[PDB]
Amino acid sequence: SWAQSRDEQNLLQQKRIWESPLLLAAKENNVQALYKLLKFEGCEVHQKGAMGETALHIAALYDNNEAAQVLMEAAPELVFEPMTSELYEGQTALHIAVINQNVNLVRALLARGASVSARATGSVFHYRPHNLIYYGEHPLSFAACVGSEEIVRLLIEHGADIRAQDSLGNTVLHILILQPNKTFACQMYNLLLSYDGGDHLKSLELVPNNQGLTPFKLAGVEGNIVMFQHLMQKRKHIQWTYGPLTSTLYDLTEIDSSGDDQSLLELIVTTKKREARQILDQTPVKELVSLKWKRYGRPYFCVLGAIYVLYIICFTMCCVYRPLKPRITNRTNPRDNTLLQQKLLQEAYVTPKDDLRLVGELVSIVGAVIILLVEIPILGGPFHVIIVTYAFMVLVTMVMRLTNSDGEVVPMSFALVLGWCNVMAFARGFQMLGPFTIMIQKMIFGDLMRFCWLMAVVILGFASAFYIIFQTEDPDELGHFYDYPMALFSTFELFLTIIDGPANYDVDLPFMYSITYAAFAIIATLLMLNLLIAMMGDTHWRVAHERDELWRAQVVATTVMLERKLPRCLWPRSGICGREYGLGDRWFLRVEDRQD
Amino acid sequence: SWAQSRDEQNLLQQKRIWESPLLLAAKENNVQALYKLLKFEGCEVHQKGAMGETALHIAALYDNNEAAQVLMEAAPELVFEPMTSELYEGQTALHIAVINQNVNLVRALLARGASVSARATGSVFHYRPHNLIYYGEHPLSFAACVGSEEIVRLLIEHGADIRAQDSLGNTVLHILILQPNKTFACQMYNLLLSYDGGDHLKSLELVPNNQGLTPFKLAGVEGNIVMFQHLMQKRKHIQWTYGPLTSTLYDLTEIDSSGDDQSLLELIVTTKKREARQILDQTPVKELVSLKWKRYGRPYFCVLGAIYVLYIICFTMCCVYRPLKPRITNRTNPRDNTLLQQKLLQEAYVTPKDDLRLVGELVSIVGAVIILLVEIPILGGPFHVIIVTYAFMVLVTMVMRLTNSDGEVVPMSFALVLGWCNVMAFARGFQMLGPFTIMIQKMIFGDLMRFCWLMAVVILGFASAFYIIFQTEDPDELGHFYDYPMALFSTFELFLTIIDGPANYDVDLPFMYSITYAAFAIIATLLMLNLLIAMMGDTHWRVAHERDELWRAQVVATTVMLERKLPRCLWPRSGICGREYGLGDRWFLRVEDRQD
């Protein structure tokens, strides 16, 4: 394991500190023990420890400016020494002094001429979940994350480049977005901005991440509202103040779907960050998408819904009327219990009333490949993998067609439950019953699978037990379960109280039926009542707000995909462009509000 | 009764105080009445009261230093006098002065040369639930429990032994753990430690209780978090401080399963203390068992689960296919209503397809005695008394086998509902549906038995009433209940709405059926609705946290038993031992955290 390797190496490091009297005197800050170990007896001052550290590195882990200065006066070359381990590859003595905010040592290390651009590419300095913090690689990134504004400027004064990026291409601004202390990071964020070039171009706030993210755009996908609101002040214009009213004009550039995929809107939808959903409730974004859905969002959705409901109600019209035959097969040849009148007609005759059937089938088959075409190239959708697999079923039904298989029904019967139950996805948005469907959507594809095993397991015993009892009995009277699958099915219906239970009084029931079914009834009811109380965890207030906050996000989810895949002839661009206006050729939204 | 004996003796004591003018003057602190009762008229100064108390004992129950000093100047032998009753056997006048924190009297009693090692073995000083407090037996234990630090040192200054134990072998540290004022007891706990011998061995914090508990270990089983966190500071090492990070190295000695049963982990599981469950959420213990379950805990659990599900699905495979016969018995000899084709085959023939059946039966019979073997030698388990009794049933089925009883089915049919429903115990841990199973586990074995009587009682009337009505009627048409057990069963199903009710319209029903069943339906529904509202007591927030805190404890419950009964070849010891490291040969866990 990797988690224990750093546990062992930390214990292994403390051994070498205790064994080496130099590293011990540099940990314990034993000043008089350093002179007797360097001036009188010439000990190895370049003594590398278990982590590739030096005596000065240990003199810095524990703030010991006295031991650090003795090690820097008798060996000034220790200042340039980086750690040479796998976990701490590249960390210098300045990194340790900046993290500990030892301003006296950082200023005394910078007087010794320490490197202000030493990358710390150790495996413990990575942006991984197993690492508690992530400050970056440069000594300037460390000063900015610890909030030590004195060291931030003290490092800039010695030639610190704010443009510097780490192995992930993150500037000193991208890292500040990924910090807990957000209220203090905005102050530090402005401190780093005051050292920019000053010109309007090649600014630091525009350097893109290696995954295509500016510091403004990274704050949106990550869900940093304190940095989102702070970075929004730099890109919004206040038109006028008229008493309480103040019509502010937001920039709207990286916020709208201007680029093919660099847009911030396209990032909030497709991200795994649960917290990023709260960005769209900010005032530059909420009234934007509010205007995107009321008009040109909801109508085109319903058209796609009315077409779909019309398409499915015509596809089902082709099912209720299918070929027919009074069973060309001879008699009940297999078993006497056979109720079959096989409906197989291979000939394309019956020309009167069958010509209309080909129209619906052609519509159903071109309307299905169209669904494949638009989907040839989960947050708020699930239901529409079902439509894609449905059109696969009508194609398999088409393969089952013109071959006249016995199972012409099975993919067809599959097809229309999916197609109608898919209409339920249109209830999203529309009205309040959308939040009801997504509670279902969360429950169907979420805990139904994991909960059914528990029921299947409890059903397993009682269902199989019943089969043992009635295997003796003649199934003519009370043949509720005569086969093993029939034993599990009749008990499955009995677990949901959709069957009256084995109730035969003309005969006498076996001894173990009344004992098992009494236990089964009581167990099956206690399973359902504790299940309802288990649903009360999603009942207090936040969950009613959580099912509503992700529904309104599920609507914005469906809204932006339409715009990307609908033609731009319809659906004009949001805002009023900055050309033919005293603006900078941007698009910009007018938003007026009132205060108290 | 014993509770009234101390009520009578307290009233009996006040009688002797009022009757005896000395004890009255020592209660009322009547100074001038003591001189006229001792110096002028020689009264019995050794006058024993109803509780074996002296005049000085009464002069101390009510802080009366004036009356105490007159009784100690005219009779200094009263200082050594203990109480000679059954309730207060051994209590001296110093105990009363220490409890009342009369520092002036304790210092004046210690000047008189009072005993600082007088055991108070009275029945009221016992650690029993009927006694409100429990401070111990020694006068030093009393000073430490009342927090009077002045008297604690004032008693030590006169030769008080901190090592002293009471009749339960509890030191002055073990008693401080069992106190309400925890925030003030830690200060007193350190005060008692500063008087130790100073050497690292034979310390007071290591003296074991008479039930094998050190003061550190007693705080865990009792659930004293304030003393657990306080006693943990003495056994955790801080490796380094790197800005926000601080990797502390906990001792991990009495916390891990080092001993056969002296471990603290093995005590939190098997204890009745409901509050001790919160110890495992403390930082030296929570991340410990978190690493014990994710690896080497959960996989071995599922292997035991996959084997069990495979073992049971093979045992049930032996049931669905059993011996067969088209009923060697003649006809429906007893009653015409008989649907029997008895399946009894005594011969071990049918060699083709029966040889495989013996393999499953042999597996099912060796897999059952194996279950007995591992269990030949309740918190978080219940479900697995069921597995033990199941393997008893397959043995009784084996006894029923090779004897060819009519009831070859009954223990077999019993066996497989238990065996499958036992799989539900594997849902513990695994995922979130574990908390659902334990809510069932609490409900099945908790209130189901006590609630059923109420239903059986309400069923009793309506079920028996129905039998009276339909005893007249010919049971051929609407014979829902023709027998007395059949009367209770059809009504039992009717109480859970698993039967359509006596619905026959070709005939005319008796007068009292429609009147009773209408009352039965309304009563049966009001029974179920008030039952669902009765489940809302376990719905507000703490219960959802309580069903979750004991589930996560139910997982740790199952985890430690595996380690004790699984071979040590697999499952390495937690931590990294202190040999080949600058440590004290302990094992120790590295735990790094971040602050704000």
Ligand SMILES: NCCOB(c1ccccc1)c1ccccc1
């Ligand atoms: N492309 C798969 C369909 O999923 B739907 C969807 C896609 C992305 C985000 C949210 C929902 C959908 C798309 C258009 C109209 C209605 C629903």
Ligand SMILES: NCCOB(c1ccccc1)c1ccccc1
């Ligand atoms: N020994 C009786 C079985 O009870 B189980 C159990 C025992 C102690 C604590 C918690 C649960 C159990 C043991 C091992 C695996 C699965 C469950």
Ligand SMILES: C[C@@H]1NC(=O)N[C@@H]1CCCCCC(=O)O
């Ligand atoms: C062991 C290393 N040697 C040292 O002198 N400091 C390091 C320890 C503290 C740095 C930990 C950084 C982290 O955990 O992210």
Ligand SMILES: C[C@@H]1NC(=O)N[C@@H]1CCCCCC(=O)O
């Ligand atoms: C009655 C006894 N006689 C006395 O002088 N004090 C006792 C009464 C108070 C002690 C009660 C201790 C307890 O209840 O635990």
Ligand SMILES: [Ca+2]
């Ligand atoms: Ca019915």
